Amino acid sequence: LKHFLNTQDWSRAELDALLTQAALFKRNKLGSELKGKSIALVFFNPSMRTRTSFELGAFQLGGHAVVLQPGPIEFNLGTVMDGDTEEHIAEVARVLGRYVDLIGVRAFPKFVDWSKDREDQVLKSFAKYSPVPVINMETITHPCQELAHALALQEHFGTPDLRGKKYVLTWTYHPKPLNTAVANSALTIATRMGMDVTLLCPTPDYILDERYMDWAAQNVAESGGSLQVSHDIDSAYAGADVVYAKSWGALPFFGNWEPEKPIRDQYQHFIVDERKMALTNNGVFSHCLPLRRNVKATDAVMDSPNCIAIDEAENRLHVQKAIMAALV
Template sequence: MPHLLDWHLLDDATWRRCLTAAVAHYRAGKTWTEAARGKSIALIFFNPSLRTRTSMELAAVQLGAHATTITPGSGTWGFAWGEGVMDGDEAEHIREAVGVLSRYYDALGVRLFASGTDYEQDRTDALLHTFARHAGVPVVNLESAFYHPCQALADAATLATRFDGDVRGRRFVLTWAYHPKALPMAVPNSALLAAARLGMHVTVARPAGFELDEGVMETARAYAAAHGTAVEETDDPDAAYDGAEVIYAKAWGGRLRYTDPDAEAALRASHRGWRVTAERMARTRDGVFMHCLPVRRGVVVDDAVLDGPQAIHLLQAEFRLHAQKAILEHLWGLPHPRLEVFGPAFVLD
């Protein structure tokens, strides 16, 4: 089953093919096709969404397919996940729900955020894999506990377009930012892996206590090493900007949230100075600013940066639509646009 649970589970050829297709869709503009006529996808959102939901709905329609969005517990039964007797509030088990939807639709999309309480469950994406295991059709991850492949493809296509395919060796900084909530690690994990797989030189800037998962870091280092680049870490919120060509800001919670939430909140609050400012951006090498959105102005990043010429976060958001088209084509085995947009690292055979 050609699931897309995350890109690191798929080979380089698939990654490059989908990346090329996303850029091709961007260059083609707002085109509508009939490539997926007769296809359908159910989008199950256990968590809120703006960009992922609307871009996937529109991508399906623009390819000629039908999309249905489902919010479990709101207009549907609540779903149970565990084993044993169902004597709680949930009326339907996820096995039956996914089994039924698989008989109606040609693909399923699911958004399942991190629990924030069970690190092993989150690290292994246990709920996402449970969902996929019971599906009889391809499943696409619309953001899980640990990964966001839709965002990752859009980010990679944005970078490839911004630098006209010449991304290898460029300096990419993934910087932690303060946020009043302990956010999941899915987006920073995926941004890190995408940049490293593109062959960029990556620096992860974060305070002590906010390290990303070592398994994700090891995968990123392997991607970078294959290109002759590296993945580094620093706890210096200023030095990381020196000479950077991309600043990707994202807040995420520390590991303490799983064992001592109060201590994690206190530690996070002590680093309010980790914010993207115009002064820090001035230290870059004409660097661009990226963020997956939604973003808190004045908390994660200053207005002067978001409203300035270095910000490409809206282009990044636009690429969500083009990435979703490429993903649906992959899931359904449809022909990707064969457009020679870049050099050998990106062009199809």
């Protein structure tokens, strides 16, 4: 009945409890909250980091993770399956639900159409047909990353209350168009936590889907923080406490990534470097990984003592354990 599809679906108190359980697990990693239980990790797209953290997380709590990497499933109802689909998600979710206690789902968008991708069909289908809790391991939003990220910020600042912090979610250069998942999640969680958020991107075409812009706005009101869109690098970084980098192809160009290649390439200066970081208030830098060094961020920034990307990546483990424990 209760799933962990997006943090936006959980009340603030529930998210706070998850973060605290995550901190507790970080102090005592071995437990029995999942003793004799199991989780099916269904990866429609490969991920070494996510597979490792979840698999180990289940093991450490006495459970077992079954890793499934399909590779042809039909999600549409009343559809004559005479095509290339062998079985309907109805049967898949229901069968797995007779075996495991939880189901994790990872499904990256096709990038051939944001119009379709934004529907989150794969995840919504599992959540609808599954008799057991479903966990978003990343589709168009990365909720587990949000919490790992948030925990890392709380540990860094020495407090659970992040209000008053200047948070800068900056777009970054990449030779190819990327998913907005991490970006959408970053906006969601930074505002939900009540920080002064600024979405820094090259042009208005890079502004995130309305769904998330509304989420952020709605969260600003609840948390007492602030939101703001910007296109000026130097002013955005100024006096910033946190800088989060993430690359993503402008939504208005989904389907054809040819005329955009020259557009993104003229913005290879949005790379986070010491010059920019020095403008902040001794702010910290982080990225969700994988990160292309000297493209999204310079080797100097990465190896800096202000980069907490490795801590954030570690926290995926502790945060995902808190989620699995809450759902069982």
